[PDB]
Assembly symmetry: C5
Homo-oligomer: 205 residues x 5
């Protein structure tokens, strides 16, 4: 009936180390990077320092409860949940998580986990100080799950790419495009999926 | 009763991972910053390194006990308590909490959590070296709770804004204004509340 | 009967999250800083990096045991003990604890917790390169316990201020004075207590 | 059974603090460094800052389950598994793990743990600005397990040395060779095994 | 007995927080530093950054077992063991432990804990760029145990001073001497013991 019951009941069924595959179908994870800031850019070392929302949604039907005469959503610590093992492939620093580590769980089992992350990347910084700008490509996918266990797809909101971008950054955003790739590597027989986020940005003035 | 008994009861009653909303009424959180130091400012990157008390006040009326023949108040570690999931939206560093992580809990269920935090912010540093100074705006609100779960209000009684501000800072405070915002974003149908703190400050002339 | 027994009996009565007051009297905490080093000084930013022992003593009668056929004292991890919530009010960095987090506990329930700490302070560094030197003032008190719950007093045994100060520092100590303040603030009706430690130091000459 | 039963069983029988030896044979560990980036190099101090995958494989046959009808692989938190106590002998910083801390456990008991690590090393940086380049040697072996308890060989995979190395690095990889050593030391009458990775790299242009 | 039974016997017998003294007598601790690297030196501030093995051996005969038809030794995590509360008295940084936190336990009850540590020291750096070099003195002893509870003594042999010292350091070791001291201090009536390590080193030319 209350939010304590809902949580207790999540923990009875929720297995944080068990991927919540429905039948033998992958977990469909939505990924959308929302850039908040570009703090440090190095044209010689080809490194950028960015703040972004790593917006991550998926379904876990074992979390699902009856929202009749109950709250329809709750905030849940991510240690009580299974969370995709997403890694930015071209990161050169540990993710610095700036926000409380809470997921929004809906009563149909939908999970919204939207951390704000500060992280350093190896990417093409050339042309940052030009009209056309530089294009930094950030690849995010699962570390240990191939395409039959986790699929990753870009979702976008219709709103402008820089509606949440700091006006006090030295840089401005020209365009953010998100591409899905499905690649088979030399380690493993199954294909791994990633979202490739192309940040087209340049200095102001 | 005694202090041991009050702490034991809180351990039995307090659900750290469950928002204490009785009858689906929003938890009213009092948020206000008291600035202690300004350590670093960068005119070009528009970044500031500040020390402040993040003064957080609310009621968890499940914690409440009868203090007729018992202490009125106890200091409690915050790990035993629910604490609001507040984030500084324009912070570019994790909060460096400088103080023991204890909240003061009153017999009526009022919780006083007043950590001292060092944190870096992306904000307007323009004019900092002038007599008018810069106005750095810092927004704080819940990360995962809308207005019907967490409301945020500023505690705006008549006090000196520099009362506890270090005389040994290279900077000085002209004014601190605190204002409540209620905004509906595209993500979600419900309004999210935030307190915007406007720090008017300058390099000492 | 042995050290094992004492640590077990401590773990049965000790409540690390419960302040061990006797009657409605405050816990009497002795705080004194012993300066080991001054590492980084900046007169422009008014910031100092210092290494000091934060010598902290108090009574916890919940720890007390009968030491007739038993050892008088044990070393105990501080996680098993209540420890005062002391903060250096003008610190600008979290304390960097250099030493094992063990307290010495005597059978009468006296606790001696003497961590070596490196910490950065916002204080008055003006005059550091003069004969008179700078006077940097450090204020240490409880974060959450008013004067009816924690009293702080300086432990002044009239020692040499430089007794344990590094000869290899670029700085030397001219004097250390430690005084108790009782102040009532706008937040609260009850008085809060602090020890104010005044470190008068200078750059060495030549 | 469902992946929940496989994972519950793995961590049920798994003994993280006990080396899973079979019939007094050493636990055969395979080690391989895949170089992703060189971030900082200092020829004066002879220090390099490297991002690399530490590819570690071994068998714990006590984890084996029948996978005729079941999934034959699962992702498991390393905290639940025994892990070889490997150390980079000439590292001058603790390893910074960038990636989710999950191993891949196969139905026959094989464990694949491939963390992405940022670490600093003491090694020969002389010649980095020349055409021949510098050769930085990284030694990796057990800290407490001799050759009768842990053996360490390089994987037979002599892949492309610069396969996943960033095109956006300042540096380029010329050659990577991996050789095994068996050394006896003054401390100990038993031999200790290590893989020596020789990284021949230089600045581009 | 297998490696698990030996560990479980240690866990039922060893107490991390209880010093394993016999009657009124101290635990005889052997301490020797083995210098691996000297990374940063500053003759103005008298500060050194060094990597060394803190080689710590002692006996706990309560841990002993019959090894005739069982393993002679096991690696054990230090959280299962009492370990000496040793501090480097003139350290100005927290010990950065570079290596897995495992002790070697022998069937006769000897414990060998040999962490590799990077740590900064306040000590005499004067003459480091000369033929005589600097003599940096490091003192190691128990933080909380007097001489009737813990005795410290240097290990019986410095096989060679430069044996495992990095040939890639800007510095070289001329000599290492390790002597024992027993000192009565103003705090306490009981004598404390320490090992004074004198590192005679110079810049290479
Ligand atoms: C060597 N690898 C493994 O064994 C697996 C699956 C592999 C992949 C596909 C994620 C892996 C490394 C990975 C990391 N994973 C750990 C266990 C594993 C079997 O799932 C891989 O094999 N190739 C990767 C990988 C990650 C990221 C990547 C890859 O390829 C190229 C460029 C960059 C930008 C570095 O992006
Ligand atoms: C995308 N988002 C979510 O899905 C929710 C609620 C959203 C809000 C309202 C807190 C969110 C991001 C948030 C963060 N939250 C995580 C889960 C969530 C549904 O509660 C949001 O949607 N808009 C925000 C937000 C945070 C801060 C913010 C926002 O808007 C504009 C400027 C800045 C200064 C960056 O401040
Ligand atoms: C705002 N505050 C509180 O509400 C209480 C008690 C307050 C005090 C008295 C410790 C507090 C902040 C404190 C910290 N505590 C957290 C809960 C509390 C009621 O115990 C305070 O109210 N004033 C303080 C305080 C700390 C330090 C300090 C203070 O005053 C002036 C200057 C400097 C040098 C910064 O030193
Ligand atoms: C002194 N040492 C010990 O007592 C053991 C086993 C030893 C070895 C062989 C791993 C040890 C240090 C080690 C570390 N181990 C901890 C317990 C031990 C008995 O397993 C050692 O004895 N020699 C080592 C060692 C580690 C690394 C090393 C060594 O030798 C040469 C060069 C460098 C680059 C420094 O690499
Ligand atoms: C003040 N101190 C105590 O009360 C005790 C025992 C003391 C000693 C002897 C370890 C202590 C500090 C110590 C640290 N210990 C914590 C509890 C204690 C009673 O064991 C001490 O009292 N003198 C020390 C000490 C440590 C290191 C040291 C000391 O003296 C001289 C030079 C330097 C280089 C600073 O080295
Ligand atoms: C949810 O609860 C309602 C009211 O109690 C009930 O009618 C309905 O059957 C429940 N839903 C499911 C899926 O059982
Ligand atoms: C608290 O307890 C006292 C004494 O037991 C009692 O008189 C009083 O009614 C109680 N308070 C309330 C609000 O009921
Ligand atoms: C301590 O124990 C002894 C017996 O060993 C006893 O005589 C004495 O009364 C005890 N002390 C106290 C305070 O009870
Ligand atoms: C695995 O499972 C099958 C089907 O249950 C069983 O018949 C068989 O004995 C097992 N196979 C092996 C090789 O152990
Ligand atoms: C150790 O065990 C063997 C039998 O396995 C036995 O011969 C020997 O006596 C035992 N040692 C001791 C000291 O009891």
């Amino acid at each position: 009936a209350d939010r304590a019951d809902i949580l207790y009941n999540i923990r009875q069924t929720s297995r944080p180390d068990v991927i919540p595959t429905q039948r033998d179908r992958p977990v469909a994870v939505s990924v959308s990077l929302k850039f908040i800031n570009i703090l440090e850019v190095n044209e010689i070392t080809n490194e950028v320092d960015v703040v972004f929302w790593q917006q991550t949604t998926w379904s876990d039907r074992t979390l699902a409860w009856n929202s009749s005469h109950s709250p329809d959503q709750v905030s849940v610590p991510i240690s009580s949940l299974w969370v995709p093992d997403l890694a930015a492939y071209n990161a050169i620093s540990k993710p610095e998580v700036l926000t409380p580590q809470l997921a929004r769980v809906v009563s149909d089992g939908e999970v919204l986990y939207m951390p704000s992350i500060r992280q350093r990347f190896s990417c093409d910084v050339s042309g940052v100080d030009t009209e056309s700008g530089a294009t930094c490509r950030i690849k995010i996918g699962s570390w240990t799950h191939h395409s039959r266990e986790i699929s990753v797809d870009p979702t976008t909101e219709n709103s402008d790419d820089s509606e949440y971008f700091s006006q006090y950054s030295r840089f401005e955003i020209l365009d953010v495009t998100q591409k899905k790739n499905s690649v088979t590597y030399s380690c493993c027989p199954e294909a791994y999926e990633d979202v490739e986020v192309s940040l087209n940005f340049r200095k102001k003035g």
